[PDB]
């Protein structure tokens, strides 16, 4: 099993992602895709006269009901269906689901934001066995059955640990972990270190935020986590080959 | 099996629909929900600066001109806003709803309109609209047997794998015939089928299938009325015991429809 998280930053090449994911899927490679839509959500929210609000912790989208609706429109409607269609065009039988569907992702609500603590793995296994490629996305369902915004990177990490994935891939609009340049990329980071809280305490906010998903995964057993470019062709195959930042 | 189609007209009481569907589901009544989102889509389209454009067909029927951008707005509202709103409402009521569009797992597949003619008579092209001719029944059966309540919506997937806008009423009718549904329920913002729409006085309470001897029987009926009735008649002929057109604004909308409130075609 390989879990692939498609970032929501501007520039993601969905066509290339779909093409590569489908190719791997047709070969028999078990796959779970998780995507986002932050950048596109901010734009639509703007256009709808409801400017995003982030609050700075010691960032996170201030999620009120209206914002959650826009979030769903973009994540669950625009991006999820765009990717499902692209995959179908490539010959992969994709099925798109949000955390609300069949109670796929359940967690605690903190503001309609929260965590994911439980996954309906039985539903995913049912679909995987029936020959479908799950394309997953937030929101999640709180213990009170309320739709809540949640961290997509953590969803992917949790899926990776539950399946003992051989590799967890994070695709973004950059070649990997950049300590904005591009020669400035970190090649490798041994699991032992990435897990150490002393190490993480020395990292810039940029990096500490981007690696938290990878941090949870390795401590959960995931053997390999890779941060790669989601703007290039064969983005997944290249990530699996070491291109980008490899953690293990 | 009971198939319920939630209309997209303005005024639908989603809370009431979800409460009723969930209560039936928790009582062991097998259900399939199909919904829409036309009114809310029009509003969002206007807000995003892409006003809806409709083609009045040579035969009276009106259809949304669906270019690529409109299709994306369509997906945002139907597949994002409405679908997830309903799934959440159902989960809150204790029904394990799972929302899907026709693209998902190739749930709904059909033919994309090669060309659309509208009123002199012109022919538009590049329209992402079509029909639904096949349903992935194995997928729905798999989910139903596993304890999930399907909440379905367009778009559909064309034979060329392109997302296409399609008639949700026909999707519901096809589903109902494939399952030999004991009832097909259409909920809207009116009490039922009005021959002199929107005159609620013109409500037709019962319509025997045998009465529509030939489609000519509806020659004098309004366009919509004609299409709604013929569709229902085909559904019944297709094996659906009864088709009901009822009010989706009231409490217990599905139960009331099943008890005969509204227009019943048999």
């Amino acid at each position: 099993m390989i879990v692939v998280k498609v970032g929501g930053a501007e520039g993601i090449n969905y066509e290339a992602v779909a093409k590569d994911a489908a190719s791997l899927w047709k070969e028999g490679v078990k796959l779970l895709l998780v995507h986002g839509g932050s950048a596109e959500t901010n734009k639509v929210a703007e256009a709808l006269g409801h400017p995003p609000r982030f609050l700075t912790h010691p960032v996170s989208r201030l999620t009120d009901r209206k914002t959650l609706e826009i979030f769903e429109m973009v994540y669950c409607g625009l991006v999820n269906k765009r990717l499902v269609e692209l995959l179908q065009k490539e010959g992969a039988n994709a099925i798109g689901l949000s955390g609300l569907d069949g109670r796929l992702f359940v967690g605690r609500r903190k503001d309609y934001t929260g965590t994911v603590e439980e996954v309906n793995k039985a539903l995913l296994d049912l679909l995987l066995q029936a020959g479908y490629l799950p394309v997953l996305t937030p929101p999640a369902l709180s213990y009170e059955n309320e739709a809540i915004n949640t961290d997509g990177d953590q969803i992917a990490a949790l899926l990776a640990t539950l399946y003992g994935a051989e590799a967890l891939v994070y695709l973004s609009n950059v070649p990997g972990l950049l300590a904005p340049d591009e020669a400035s990329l970190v090649r490798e980071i041994p699991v032992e270190r990435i897990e150490d809280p002393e190490y993480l305490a020395l990292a810039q906010g940029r990096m500490k935020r981007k690696v938290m998903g990878a941090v949870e995964a390795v401590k959960g057993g995931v053997k390999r986590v890779v941060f790669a470019d989601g703007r290039v062709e064969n983005p997944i195959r290249r990530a699996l080959s070491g291109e980008g930042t490899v953690v293990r």
Side-chain angles (χ1 to χ4, degrees), chain A residues 4-55 57-58 60-150:
Chain A
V4 178
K5 169 66 173 70
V6 182
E10 179 179 4
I12 296 297
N13 190 327
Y14 285 102
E15 292 69 23
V17 172
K19 197 173 195 61
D20 205 35
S23 180
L24 285 161
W25 186 76
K26 288 183 284 187
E27 289 185 3
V29 178
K30 276 297 202 61
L31 186 62
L32 283 178
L33 297 179
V34 182
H35 65 78
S38 59
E40 296 190 62
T41 292
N42 298 325
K43 282 176 170 293
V44 175
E46 217 79 61
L48 291 175
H50 296 78
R53 295 185 179 190
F54 301 75
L55 290 170
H57 301 180
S60 72
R61 181 187 306 281
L62 196 56
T63 309
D64 60 353
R65 292 179 179 178
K66 163 263 304 207
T67 294
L68 187 55
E69 302 190 317
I70 298 177
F71 182 101
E72 294 179 326
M73 282 180 80
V74 178
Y75 278 69
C76 310
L78 184 70
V79 186
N80 190 251
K81 306 318 172 189
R82 170 194 299 150
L83 191 46
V84 169
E85 175 185 20
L86 283 174
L87 289 161
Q88 290 290 350
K89 287 181 173 173
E90 291 301 316
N93 206 346
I95 181 170
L97 298 169
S98 80
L100 310 178
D101 303 298
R103 300 203 282 280
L104 175 58
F105 300 135
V106 177
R108 185 173 64 68
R109 178 187 177 191
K110 285 183 175 181
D111 195 21
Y112 291 94
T113 301
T115 64
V116 171
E117 324 270 21
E118 295 160 50
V119 177
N120 188 339
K121 190 170 184 293
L123 171 59
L124 292 181
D125 288 341
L126 182 68
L127 298 169
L128 289 167
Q129 180 167 298
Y132 298 98
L133 167 50
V135 179
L136 322 175
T137 177
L141 193 63
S142 75
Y143 287 114
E144 269 50 66
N145 297 127
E146 311 157 290
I148 51 171
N149 183 351
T150 193

Side-chain angles (χ1 to χ4, degrees), chain A residues 186 188-191 193-207:
Chain A
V186 180
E188 293 166 291
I189 303 178
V191 183
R193 186 170 301 174
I194 233 314
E195 289 180 358
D196 190 339
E198 305 310 337
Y199 173 70
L200 301 170
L202 296 175
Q204 45 190 301
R206 171 94 180 181
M207 300 296 298

